[PDB]
Amino acid sequence: KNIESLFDYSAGQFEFIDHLLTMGVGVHFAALIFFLVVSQFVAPKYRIATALSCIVMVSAGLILNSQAVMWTDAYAYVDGSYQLQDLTFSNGYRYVNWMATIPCLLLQLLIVLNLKGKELFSTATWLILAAWGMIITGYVGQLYEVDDIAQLMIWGAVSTAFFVVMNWIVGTKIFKNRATMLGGTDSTITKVFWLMMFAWTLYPIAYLVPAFMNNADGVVLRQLLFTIADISSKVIYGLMITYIAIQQSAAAGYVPAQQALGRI
Ligand SMILES: *C/C=C(C)/C=C/C=C(C)/C=C/C1=C(C)CCCC1(C)C
Ligand SMILES: CCCCCCCC/C=C/CCCCCCCC(=O)O
Ligand SMILES: CCCCCCCC/C=C\CCCCCCCC(=O)O
Ligand SMILES: [Cl-]
Ligand SMILES: [Cl-]
């Protein structure tokens, strides 16, 4: 049902996709070790924000690893090109994983925004429902990226509606609670908003690749966009969330955070 199954791949195309996914695994698990060791310098009220970055690193890294092995399982070098064998490759498993990773990314933002109590629970609930609506409708849409491009576009429009409403909740909460944030992170969090707008918009662009570049090079382009988007939306984003958590911890008087920032 996916455009990947339609083509043979040159050795160059096949190996580049394999290296993209493998490098993605290495970046996420390298960052996992960073978040783990820095978590001891985060104050208790923010420490779950850094733990969520560890959770996202392993979740994303495992999906990239699974995609890399599925890629090599599905194709073999036959008569001068990589050709589909008995097993299949699909991006649909990324969508299932977003059902978990996107709520984690959203929750760690709400934590460093200093939301608590009922506002935290209600904001998280609406954000997760909007995210799940976006993911599920996009998942259905990409089942038609070979058979029915018109249906891919309409499910994509519905998914984009959820996306825009989710981004509006995020922006409203960020610019409303920016004033509560300590240690100059009221400025940093505005950059986090724009990083999210940029990086998350790469995913719908990848989703439309079957509509504007339905060939083997488009398959490469989509994996390239996923790689840029994953590293930006999870790794760079998590590094900024962790910086904000540590900086607010130090401004709130958490001594391990003050000493960690002092030694750098
Ligand atoms: C770490 C993974 C992330 C941040 C995934 C983000 C995914 C999206 C923002 C998905 C967006 C989509 C649309 C905007 C409509 C087209 C279909 C969806 C899934 C791709
Ligand atoms: C935050 C940014 C993360 C960047 C991740 C991407 C790193 C690798 C980028 C690729 C450089 C282009 C390589 C040329 C592709 C050759 C085309 C082909 O034969 O398949
Ligand atoms: C096995 C595939 C290749 C493995 C790649 C290993 C290289 C990892 C490179 C950077 C990972 C990103 C993690 C960044 C940690 C914090 C960096 C910083 O403090 O500036
Ligand atoms: Cl605390
Ligand atoms: Cl993911």
Side-chain angles (χ1 to χ4, degrees), residues 1-4 6-7 141-142 144-154 156 203-215 218-219 221-222 225:
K1 300 304 172 184
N2 55 319
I3 64 167
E4 287 82 9
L6 300 176
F7 314 108
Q142 57 89 44
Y144 298 96
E145 67 180 39
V146 171
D147 297 334
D148 194 349
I149 282 291
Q151 190 161 182
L152 170 112
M153 281 167 166
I154 300 309
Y203 293 94
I205 296 174
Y207 171 96
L208 290 166
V209 164
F212 65 85
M213 192 180 297
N214 185 19
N215 53 45
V219 169
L221 173 60
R222 173 151 73 184
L225 293 169

PDB file of all heavy atoms in Angstrom, residues 1-4 6-7 141-142 144-154 156 203-215 218-219 221-222 225:
ATOM      1  N   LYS A   1       0.819  -1.205   0.000  1.00  0.00           N
ATOM      2  CA  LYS A   1       0.000   0.000   0.000  1.00  0.00           C
ATOM      3  C   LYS A   1       0.858   1.262   0.000  1.00  0.00           C
ATOM      4  O   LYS A   1       0.351   2.359  -0.221  1.00  0.00           O
ATOM      5  CB  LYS A   1      -0.941   0.010   1.210  1.00  0.00           C
ATOM      6  CG  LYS A   1      -1.901  -1.164   1.257  1.00  0.00           C
ATOM      7  CD  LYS A   1      -2.734  -1.246  -0.013  1.00  0.00           C
ATOM      8  CE  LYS A   1      -3.554  -2.527  -0.052  1.00  0.00           C
ATOM      9  NZ  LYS A   1      -4.308  -2.661  -1.330  1.00  0.00           N
ATOM     10  N   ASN A   2       2.156   1.101   0.249  1.00  0.00           N
ATOM     11  CA  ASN A   2       3.089   2.218   0.339  1.00  0.00           C
ATOM     12  C   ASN A   2       3.941   2.303  -0.922  1.00  0.00           C
ATOM     13  O   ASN A   2       4.179   1.298  -1.598  1.00  0.00           O
ATOM     14  CB  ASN A   2       3.987   2.071   1.566  1.00  0.00           C
ATOM     15  CG  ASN A   2       4.719   0.740   1.597  1.00  0.00           C
ATOM     16  OD1 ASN A   2       4.149  -0.303   1.277  1.00  0.00           O
ATOM     17  ND2 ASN A   2       5.990   0.773   1.979  1.00  0.00           N
ATOM     18  N   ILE A   3       4.406   3.519  -1.238  1.00  0.00           N
ATOM     19  CA  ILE A   3       5.144   3.699  -2.487  1.00  0.00           C
ATOM     20  C   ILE A   3       6.500   3.008  -2.457  1.00  0.00           C
ATOM     21  O   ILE A   3       7.066   2.734  -3.521  1.00  0.00           O
ATOM     22  CB  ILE A   3       5.327   5.189  -2.841  1.00  0.00           C
ATOM     23  CG1 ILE A   3       6.177   5.900  -1.788  1.00  0.00           C
ATOM     24  CG2 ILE A   3       3.973   5.863  -3.026  1.00  0.00           C
ATOM     25  CD1 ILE A   3       6.657   7.274  -2.223  1.00  0.00           C
ATOM     26  N   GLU A   4       7.041   2.709  -1.271  1.00  0.00           N
ATOM     27  CA  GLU A   4       8.330   2.023  -1.208  1.00  0.00           C
ATOM     28  C   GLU A   4       8.286   0.696  -1.952  1.00  0.00           C
ATOM     29  O   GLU A   4       9.255   0.310  -2.617  1.00  0.00           O
ATOM     30  CB  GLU A   4       8.748   1.800   0.244  1.00  0.00           C
ATOM     31  CG  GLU A   4       9.210   3.058   0.960  1.00  0.00           C
ATOM     32  CD  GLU A   4       8.067   3.896   1.498  1.00  0.00           C
ATOM     33  OE1 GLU A   4       6.910   3.432   1.465  1.00  0.00           O
ATOM     34  OE2 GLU A   4       8.329   5.025   1.963  1.00  0.00           O
ATOM     35  N   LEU A   6       6.871  -0.080  -4.621  1.00  0.00           N
ATOM     36  CA  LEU A   6       6.705   0.014  -6.070  1.00  0.00           C
ATOM     37  C   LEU A   6       8.014  -0.037  -6.850  1.00  0.00           C
ATOM     38  O   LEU A   6       7.978  -0.245  -8.070  1.00  0.00           O
ATOM     39  CB  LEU A   6       5.980   1.316  -6.434  1.00  0.00           C
ATOM     40  CG  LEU A   6       4.577   1.543  -5.872  1.00  0.00           C
ATOM     41  CD1 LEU A   6       4.073   2.919  -6.275  1.00  0.00           C
ATOM     42  CD2 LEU A   6       3.621   0.457  -6.345  1.00  0.00           C
ATOM     43  N   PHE A   7       9.159   0.159  -6.202  1.00  0.00           N
ATOM     44  CA  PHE A   7      10.399   0.420  -6.919  1.00  0.00           C
ATOM     45  C   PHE A   7      11.504  -0.543  -6.518  1.00  0.00           C
ATOM     46  O   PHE A   7      11.523  -1.074  -5.403  1.00  0.00           O
ATOM     47  CB  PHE A   7      10.883   1.856  -6.673  1.00  0.00           C
ATOM     48  CG  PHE A   7       9.798   2.878  -6.804  1.00  0.00           C
ATOM     49  CD1 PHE A   7       9.294   3.518  -5.683  1.00  0.00           C
ATOM     50  CD2 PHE A   7       9.269   3.185  -8.050  1.00  0.00           C
ATOM     51  CE1 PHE A   7       8.286   4.459  -5.799  1.00  0.00           C
ATOM     52  CE2 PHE A   7       8.258   4.123  -8.175  1.00  0.00           C
ATOM     53  CZ  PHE A   7       7.760   4.754  -7.045  1.00  0.00           C
ATOM     54  N   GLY A 141      -4.875   7.949   6.083  1.00  0.00           N
ATOM     55  CA  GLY A 141      -4.586   8.578   4.808  1.00  0.00           C
ATOM     56  C   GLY A 141      -3.465   7.901   4.042  1.00  0.00           C
ATOM     57  O   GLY A 141      -3.579   7.676   2.836  1.00  0.00           O
ATOM     58  N   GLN A 142      -2.364   7.573   4.727  1.00  0.00           N
ATOM     59  CA  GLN A 142      -1.214   7.017   4.019  1.00  0.00           C
ATOM     60  C   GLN A 142      -1.437   5.576   3.574  1.00  0.00           C
ATOM     61  O   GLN A 142      -0.633   5.060   2.789  1.00  0.00           O
ATOM     62  CB  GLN A 142       0.054   7.127   4.877  1.00  0.00           C
ATOM     63  CG  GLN A 142      -0.016   6.469   6.251  1.00  0.00           C
ATOM     64  CD  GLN A 142       0.418   5.016   6.226  1.00  0.00           C
ATOM     65  OE1 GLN A 142       1.425   4.665   5.605  1.00  0.00           O
ATOM     66  NE2 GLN A 142      -0.342   4.163   6.893  1.00  0.00           N
ATOM     67  N   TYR A 144      -3.561   4.997   1.526  1.00  0.00           N
ATOM     68  CA  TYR A 144      -4.023   5.235   0.168  1.00  0.00           C
ATOM     69  C   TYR A 144      -2.978   5.923  -0.699  1.00  0.00           C
ATOM     70  O   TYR A 144      -3.304   6.370  -1.804  1.00  0.00           O
ATOM     71  CB  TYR A 144      -5.310   6.069   0.190  1.00  0.00           C
ATOM     72  CG  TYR A 144      -6.457   5.381   0.894  1.00  0.00           C
ATOM     73  CD1 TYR A 144      -6.734   5.645   2.230  1.00  0.00           C
ATOM     74  CD2 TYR A 144      -7.257   4.459   0.227  1.00  0.00           C
ATOM     75  CE1 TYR A 144      -7.778   5.017   2.880  1.00  0.00           C
ATOM     76  CE2 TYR A 144      -8.304   3.822   0.870  1.00  0.00           C
ATOM     77  CZ  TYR A 144      -8.560   4.108   2.196  1.00  0.00           C
ATOM     78  OH  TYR A 144      -9.597   3.485   2.849  1.00  0.00           O
ATOM     79  N   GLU A 145      -1.728   6.009  -0.238  1.00  0.00           N
ATOM     80  CA  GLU A 145      -0.733   6.776  -0.977  1.00  0.00           C
ATOM     81  C   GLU A 145      -0.366   6.141  -2.312  1.00  0.00           C
ATOM     82  O   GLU A 145       0.265   6.810  -3.136  1.00  0.00           O
ATOM     83  CB  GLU A 145       0.524   6.992  -0.120  1.00  0.00           C
ATOM     84  CG  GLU A 145       1.334   5.743   0.193  1.00  0.00           C
ATOM     85  CD  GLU A 145       2.571   6.045   1.037  1.00  0.00           C
ATOM     86  OE1 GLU A 145       2.493   6.890   1.960  1.00  0.00           O
ATOM     87  OE2 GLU A 145       3.634   5.448   0.769  1.00  0.00           O
ATOM     88  N   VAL A 146      -0.745   4.888  -2.550  1.00  0.00           N
ATOM     89  CA  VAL A 146      -0.597   4.252  -3.861  1.00  0.00           C
ATOM     90  C   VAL A 146      -1.931   4.173  -4.593  1.00  0.00           C
ATOM     91  O   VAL A 146      -2.025   4.529  -5.767  1.00  0.00           O
ATOM     92  CB  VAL A 146       0.039   2.851  -3.711  1.00  0.00           C
ATOM     93  CG1 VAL A 146      -0.008   2.097  -5.039  1.00  0.00           C
ATOM     94  CG2 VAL A 146       1.473   2.962  -3.212  1.00  0.00           C
ATOM     95  N   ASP A 147      -2.983   3.727  -3.904  1.00  0.00           N
ATOM     96  CA  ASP A 147      -4.244   3.413  -4.570  1.00  0.00           C
ATOM     97  C   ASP A 147      -5.118   4.637  -4.818  1.00  0.00           C
ATOM     98  O   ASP A 147      -5.855   4.666  -5.810  1.00  0.00           O
ATOM     99  CB  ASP A 147      -5.030   2.389  -3.747  1.00  0.00           C
ATOM    100  CG  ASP A 147      -4.308   1.060  -3.622  1.00  0.00           C
ATOM    101  OD1 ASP A 147      -3.495   0.736  -4.514  1.00  0.00           O
ATOM    102  OD2 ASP A 147      -4.557   0.335  -2.633  1.00  0.00           O
ATOM    103  N   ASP A 148      -5.069   5.654  -3.942  1.00  0.00           N
ATOM    104  CA  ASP A 148      -6.081   6.714  -4.014  1.00  0.00           C
ATOM    105  C   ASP A 148      -5.491   8.006  -3.430  1.00  0.00           C
ATOM    106  O   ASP A 148      -5.748   8.375  -2.280  1.00  0.00           O
ATOM    107  CB  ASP A 148      -7.355   6.296  -3.279  1.00  0.00           C
ATOM    108  CG  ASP A 148      -8.538   7.191  -3.588  1.00  0.00           C
ATOM    109  OD1 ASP A 148      -8.345   8.260  -4.204  1.00  0.00           O
ATOM    110  OD2 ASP A 148      -9.667   6.825  -3.192  1.00  0.00           O
ATOM    111  N   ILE A 149      -4.710   8.710  -4.256  1.00  0.00           N
ATOM    112  CA  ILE A 149      -4.059   9.951  -3.827  1.00  0.00           C
ATOM    113  C   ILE A 149      -5.080  10.990  -3.373  1.00  0.00           C
ATOM    114  O   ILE A 149      -4.815  11.772  -2.450  1.00  0.00           O
ATOM    115  CB  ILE A 149      -3.167  10.496  -4.964  1.00  0.00           C
ATOM    116  CG1 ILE A 149      -1.851   9.721  -5.021  1.00  0.00           C
ATOM    117  CG2 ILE A 149      -2.878  11.981  -4.774  1.00  0.00           C
ATOM    118  CD1 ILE A 149      -0.949   9.989  -3.836  1.00  0.00           C
ATOM    119  N   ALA A 150      -6.256  11.020  -4.004  1.00  0.00           N
ATOM    120  CA  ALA A 150      -7.294  11.955  -3.579  1.00  0.00           C
ATOM    121  C   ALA A 150      -7.713  11.685  -2.142  1.00  0.00           C
ATOM    122  O   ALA A 150      -7.941  12.620  -1.367  1.00  0.00           O
ATOM    123  CB  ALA A 150      -8.500  11.868  -4.514  1.00  0.00           C
ATOM    124  N   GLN A 151      -7.809  10.408  -1.767  1.00  0.00           N
ATOM    125  CA  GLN A 151      -8.176  10.076  -0.399  1.00  0.00           C
ATOM    126  C   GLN A 151      -7.039  10.376   0.566  1.00  0.00           C
ATOM    127  O   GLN A 151      -7.288  10.769   1.710  1.00  0.00           O
ATOM    128  CB  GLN A 151      -8.598   8.609  -0.302  1.00  0.00           C
ATOM    129  CG  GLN A 151      -9.209   8.282   1.040  1.00  0.00           C
ATOM    130  CD  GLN A 151     -10.047   7.024   1.046  1.00  0.00           C
ATOM    131  OE1 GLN A 151     -10.633   6.673   2.071  1.00  0.00           O
ATOM    132  NE2 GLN A 151     -10.113   6.335  -0.094  1.00  0.00           N
ATOM    133  N   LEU A 152      -5.792  10.205   0.123  1.00  0.00           N
ATOM    134  CA  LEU A 152      -4.662  10.637   0.937  1.00  0.00           C
ATOM    135  C   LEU A 152      -4.750  12.127   1.237  1.00  0.00           C
ATOM    136  O   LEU A 152      -4.493  12.562   2.366  1.00  0.00           O
ATOM    137  CB  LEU A 152      -3.348  10.314   0.227  1.00  0.00           C
ATOM    138  CG  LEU A 152      -2.087  10.916   0.855  1.00  0.00           C
ATOM    139  CD1 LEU A 152      -1.206   9.827   1.439  1.00  0.00           C
ATOM    140  CD2 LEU A 152      -1.316  11.739  -0.162  1.00  0.00           C
ATOM    141  N   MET A 153      -5.140  12.924   0.241  1.00  0.00           N
ATOM    142  CA  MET A 153      -5.197  14.371   0.436  1.00  0.00           C
ATOM    143  C   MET A 153      -6.307  14.767   1.404  1.00  0.00           C
ATOM    144  O   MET A 153      -6.120  15.673   2.224  1.00  0.00           O
ATOM    145  CB  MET A 153      -5.374  15.071  -0.909  1.00  0.00           C
ATOM    146  CG  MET A 153      -4.077  15.183  -1.694  1.00  0.00           C
ATOM    147  SD  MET A 153      -4.338  15.665  -3.409  1.00  0.00           S
ATOM    148  CE  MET A 153      -2.673  16.107  -3.893  1.00  0.00           C
ATOM    149  N   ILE A 154      -7.463  14.104   1.333  1.00  0.00           N
ATOM    150  CA  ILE A 154      -8.584  14.512   2.179  1.00  0.00           C
ATOM    151  C   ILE A 154      -8.355  14.089   3.626  1.00  0.00           C
ATOM    152  O   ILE A 154      -8.615  14.865   4.557  1.00  0.00           O
ATOM    153  CB  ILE A 154      -9.912  13.968   1.623  1.00  0.00           C
ATOM    154  CG1 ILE A 154     -10.147  14.500   0.211  1.00  0.00           C
ATOM    155  CG2 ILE A 154     -11.072  14.363   2.525  1.00  0.00           C
ATOM    156  CD1 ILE A 154     -10.020  16.003   0.094  1.00  0.00           C
ATOM    157  N   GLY A 156      -5.486  13.825   4.843  1.00  0.00           N
ATOM    158  CA  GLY A 156      -4.450  14.755   5.247  1.00  0.00           C
ATOM    159  C   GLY A 156      -5.001  16.111   5.642  1.00  0.00           C
ATOM    160  O   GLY A 156      -4.471  16.757   6.549  1.00  0.00           O
ATOM    161  N   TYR A 203       6.806  16.659   8.889  1.00  0.00           N
ATOM    162  CA  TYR A 203       6.113  15.375   8.769  1.00  0.00           C
ATOM    163  C   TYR A 203       4.990  15.419   7.743  1.00  0.00           C
ATOM    164  O   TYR A 203       4.876  14.470   6.947  1.00  0.00           O
ATOM    165  CB  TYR A 203       5.612  14.911  10.142  1.00  0.00           C
ATOM    166  CG  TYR A 203       6.734  14.571  11.097  1.00  0.00           C
ATOM    167  CD1 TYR A 203       7.212  15.513  11.988  1.00  0.00           C
ATOM    168  CD2 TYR A 203       7.330  13.314  11.084  1.00  0.00           C
ATOM    169  CE1 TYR A 203       8.240  15.216  12.859  1.00  0.00           C
ATOM    170  CE2 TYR A 203       8.366  13.003  11.958  1.00  0.00           C
ATOM    171  CZ  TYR A 203       8.814  13.963  12.839  1.00  0.00           C
ATOM    172  OH  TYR A 203       9.843  13.688  13.710  1.00  0.00           O
ATOM    173  N   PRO A 204       4.121  16.435   7.708  1.00  0.00           N
ATOM    174  CA  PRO A 204       3.139  16.490   6.611  1.00  0.00           C
ATOM    175  C   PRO A 204       3.773  16.674   5.245  1.00  0.00           C
ATOM    176  O   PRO A 204       3.189  16.246   4.243  1.00  0.00           O
ATOM    177  CB  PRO A 204       2.246  17.682   6.986  1.00  0.00           C
ATOM    178  CG  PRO A 204       3.023  18.454   8.025  1.00  0.00           C
ATOM    179  CD  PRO A 204       3.816  17.425   8.757  1.00  0.00           C
ATOM    180  N   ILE A 205       4.950  17.303   5.162  1.00  0.00           N
ATOM    181  CA  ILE A 205       5.635  17.397   3.873  1.00  0.00           C
ATOM    182  C   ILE A 205       6.056  16.010   3.397  1.00  0.00           C
ATOM    183  O   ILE A 205       5.880  15.648   2.226  1.00  0.00           O
ATOM    184  CB  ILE A 205       6.839  18.351   3.971  1.00  0.00           C
ATOM    185  CG1 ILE A 205       6.359  19.774   4.269  1.00  0.00           C
ATOM    186  CG2 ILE A 205       7.656  18.301   2.678  1.00  0.00           C
ATOM    187  CD1 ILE A 205       7.479  20.774   4.535  1.00  0.00           C
ATOM    188  N   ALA A 206       6.620  15.211   4.305  1.00  0.00           N
ATOM    189  CA  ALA A 206       6.962  13.834   3.970  1.00  0.00           C
ATOM    190  C   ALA A 206       5.720  13.041   3.580  1.00  0.00           C
ATOM    191  O   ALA A 206       5.764  12.205   2.669  1.00  0.00           O
ATOM    192  CB  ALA A 206       7.673  13.175   5.154  1.00  0.00           C
ATOM    193  N   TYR A 207       4.598  13.311   4.248  1.00  0.00           N
ATOM    194  CA  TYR A 207       3.354  12.597   3.977  1.00  0.00           C
ATOM    195  C   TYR A 207       2.873  12.829   2.550  1.00  0.00           C
ATOM    196  O   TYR A 207       2.237  11.950   1.958  1.00  0.00           O
ATOM    197  CB  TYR A 207       2.309  13.042   5.008  1.00  0.00           C
ATOM    198  CG  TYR A 207       0.876  12.598   4.803  1.00  0.00           C
ATOM    199  CD1 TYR A 207       0.378  11.474   5.455  1.00  0.00           C
ATOM    200  CD2 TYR A 207       0.000  13.342   4.017  1.00  0.00           C
ATOM    201  CE1 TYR A 207      -0.944  11.086   5.306  1.00  0.00           C
ATOM    202  CE2 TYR A 207      -1.321  12.960   3.857  1.00  0.00           C
ATOM    203  CZ  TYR A 207      -1.784  11.827   4.504  1.00  0.00           C
ATOM    204  OH  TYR A 207      -3.102  11.446   4.353  1.00  0.00           O
ATOM    205  N   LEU A 208       3.181  13.992   1.977  1.00  0.00           N
ATOM    206  CA  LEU A 208       2.738  14.355   0.635  1.00  0.00           C
ATOM    207  C   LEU A 208       3.714  13.945  -0.459  1.00  0.00           C
ATOM    208  O   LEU A 208       3.400  14.125  -1.640  1.00  0.00           O
ATOM    209  CB  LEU A 208       2.495  15.867   0.561  1.00  0.00           C
ATOM    210  CG  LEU A 208       1.283  16.371   1.340  1.00  0.00           C
ATOM    211  CD1 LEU A 208       1.313  17.890   1.485  1.00  0.00           C
ATOM    212  CD2 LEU A 208      -0.010  15.913   0.668  1.00  0.00           C
ATOM    213  N   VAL A 209       4.879  13.408  -0.108  1.00  0.00           N
ATOM    214  CA  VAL A 209       5.863  12.985  -1.105  1.00  0.00           C
ATOM    215  C   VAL A 209       5.232  12.076  -2.163  1.00  0.00           C
ATOM    216  O   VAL A 209       5.519  12.264  -3.354  1.00  0.00           O
ATOM    217  CB  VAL A 209       7.074  12.307  -0.440  1.00  0.00           C
ATOM    218  CG1 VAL A 209       7.891  11.517  -1.473  1.00  0.00           C
ATOM    219  CG2 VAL A 209       7.941  13.348   0.236  1.00  0.00           C
ATOM    220  N   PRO A 210       4.374  11.103  -1.816  1.00  0.00           N
ATOM    221  CA  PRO A 210       3.750  10.291  -2.879  1.00  0.00           C
ATOM    222  C   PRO A 210       2.934  11.103  -3.867  1.00  0.00           C
ATOM    223  O   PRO A 210       2.684  10.624  -4.982  1.00  0.00           O
ATOM    224  CB  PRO A 210       2.866   9.306  -2.103  1.00  0.00           C
ATOM    225  CG  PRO A 210       3.545   9.164  -0.776  1.00  0.00           C
ATOM    226  CD  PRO A 210       4.092  10.539  -0.477  1.00  0.00           C
ATOM    227  N   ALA A 211       2.515  12.313  -3.507  1.00  0.00           N
ATOM    228  CA  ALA A 211       1.748  13.144  -4.423  1.00  0.00           C
ATOM    229  C   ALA A 211       2.627  13.967  -5.358  1.00  0.00           C
ATOM    230  O   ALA A 211       2.218  14.231  -6.494  1.00  0.00           O
ATOM    231  CB  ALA A 211       0.815  14.072  -3.639  1.00  0.00           C
ATOM    232  N   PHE A 212       3.823  14.383  -4.928  1.00  0.00           N
ATOM    233  CA  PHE A 212       4.654  15.234  -5.771  1.00  0.00           C
ATOM    234  C   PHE A 212       5.976  14.613  -6.197  1.00  0.00           C
ATOM    235  O   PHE A 212       6.667  15.200  -7.037  1.00  0.00           O
ATOM    236  CB  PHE A 212       4.918  16.598  -5.097  1.00  0.00           C
ATOM    237  CG  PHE A 212       5.734  16.542  -3.817  1.00  0.00           C
ATOM    238  CD1 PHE A 212       7.123  16.520  -3.854  1.00  0.00           C
ATOM    239  CD2 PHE A 212       5.109  16.590  -2.581  1.00  0.00           C
ATOM    240  CE1 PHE A 212       7.868  16.503  -2.680  1.00  0.00           C
ATOM    241  CE2 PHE A 212       5.846  16.572  -1.402  1.00  0.00           C
ATOM    242  CZ  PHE A 212       7.226  16.531  -1.450  1.00  0.00           C
ATOM    243  N   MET A 213       6.345  13.442  -5.674  1.00  0.00           N
ATOM    244  CA  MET A 213       7.572  12.800  -6.120  1.00  0.00           C
ATOM    245  C   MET A 213       7.430  11.293  -5.900  1.00  0.00           C
ATOM    246  O   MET A 213       8.068  10.695  -5.037  1.00  0.00           O
ATOM    247  CB  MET A 213       8.802  13.357  -5.400  1.00  0.00           C
ATOM    248  CG  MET A 213      10.106  12.914  -6.040  1.00  0.00           C
ATOM    249  SD  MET A 213      11.553  13.556  -5.190  1.00  0.00           S
ATOM    250  CE  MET A 213      11.338  15.320  -5.434  1.00  0.00           C
ATOM    251  N   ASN A 214       6.572  10.668  -6.709  1.00  0.00           N
ATOM    252  CA  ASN A 214       6.299   9.235  -6.599  1.00  0.00           C
ATOM    253  C   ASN A 214       7.313   8.474  -7.447  1.00  0.00           C
ATOM    254  O   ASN A 214       7.027   7.994  -8.546  1.00  0.00           O
ATOM    255  CB  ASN A 214       4.867   8.925  -7.018  1.00  0.00           C
ATOM    256  CG  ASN A 214       4.500   7.466  -6.797  1.00  0.00           C
ATOM    257  OD1 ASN A 214       5.159   6.758  -6.035  1.00  0.00           O
ATOM    258  ND2 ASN A 214       3.448   7.011  -7.464  1.00  0.00           N
ATOM    259  N   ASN A 215       8.528   8.371  -6.916  1.00  0.00           N
ATOM    260  CA  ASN A 215       9.584   7.574  -7.525  1.00  0.00           C
ATOM    261  C   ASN A 215      10.578   7.208  -6.429  1.00  0.00           C
ATOM    262  O   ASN A 215      10.419   7.596  -5.268  1.00  0.00           O
ATOM    263  CB  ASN A 215      10.244   8.310  -8.698  1.00  0.00           C
ATOM    264  CG  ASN A 215      10.720   9.703  -8.333  1.00  0.00           C
ATOM    265  OD1 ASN A 215      11.332   9.913  -7.285  1.00  0.00           O
ATOM    266  ND2 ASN A 215      10.446  10.668  -9.209  1.00  0.00           N
ATOM    267  N   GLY A 218      11.974   9.987  -4.455  1.00  0.00           N
ATOM    268  CA  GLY A 218      11.038  10.480  -3.456  1.00  0.00           C
ATOM    269  C   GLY A 218      11.047   9.644  -2.188  1.00  0.00           C
ATOM    270  O   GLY A 218      10.899  10.170  -1.083  1.00  0.00           O
ATOM    271  N   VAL A 219      11.221   8.328  -2.332  1.00  0.00           N
ATOM    272  CA  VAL A 219      11.352   7.455  -1.165  1.00  0.00           C
ATOM    273  C   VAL A 219      12.551   7.873  -0.328  1.00  0.00           C
ATOM    274  O   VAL A 219      12.486   7.912   0.907  1.00  0.00           O
ATOM    275  CB  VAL A 219      11.459   5.985  -1.614  1.00  0.00           C
ATOM    276  CG1 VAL A 219      11.869   5.087  -0.441  1.00  0.00           C
ATOM    277  CG2 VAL A 219      10.144   5.514  -2.221  1.00  0.00           C
ATOM    278  N   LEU A 221      13.894  10.907  -0.336  1.00  0.00           N
ATOM    279  CA  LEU A 221      13.587  12.222   0.218  1.00  0.00           C
ATOM    280  C   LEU A 221      12.741  12.111   1.482  1.00  0.00           C
ATOM    281  O   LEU A 221      12.979  12.828   2.465  1.00  0.00           O
ATOM    282  CB  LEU A 221      12.875  13.076  -0.834  1.00  0.00           C
ATOM    283  CG  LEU A 221      12.343  14.432  -0.369  1.00  0.00           C
ATOM    284  CD1 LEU A 221      13.475  15.307   0.158  1.00  0.00           C
ATOM    285  CD2 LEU A 221      11.596  15.122  -1.507  1.00  0.00           C
ATOM    286  N   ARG A 222      11.751  11.217   1.480  1.00  0.00           N
ATOM    287  CA  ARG A 222      10.881  11.087   2.644  1.00  0.00           C
ATOM    288  C   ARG A 222      11.653  10.603   3.863  1.00  0.00           C
ATOM    289  O   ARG A 222      11.447  11.103   4.974  1.00  0.00           O
ATOM    290  CB  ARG A 222       9.718  10.142   2.345  1.00  0.00           C
ATOM    291  CG  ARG A 222       8.877   9.843   3.579  1.00  0.00           C
ATOM    292  CD  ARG A 222       7.437   9.555   3.218  1.00  0.00           C
ATOM    293  NE  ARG A 222       7.291   8.254   2.587  1.00  0.00           N
ATOM    294  CZ  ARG A 222       6.144   7.786   2.107  1.00  0.00           C
ATOM    295  NH1 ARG A 222       5.045   8.525   2.174  1.00  0.00           N
ATOM    296  NH2 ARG A 222       6.102   6.586   1.558  1.00  0.00           N
ATOM    297  N   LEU A 225      13.654  13.537   5.109  1.00  0.00           N
ATOM    298  CA  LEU A 225      12.840  14.487   5.863  1.00  0.00           C
ATOM    299  C   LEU A 225      12.508  13.951   7.252  1.00  0.00           C
ATOM    300  O   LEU A 225      12.551  14.697   8.240  1.00  0.00           O
ATOM    301  CB  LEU A 225      11.559  14.806   5.087  1.00  0.00           C
ATOM    302  CG  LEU A 225      11.716  15.578   3.780  1.00  0.00           C
ATOM    303  CD1 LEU A 225      10.402  15.557   3.013  1.00  0.00           C
ATOM    304  CD2 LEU A 225      12.147  17.014   4.056  1.00  0.00           C
TER     305      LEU A 225
END
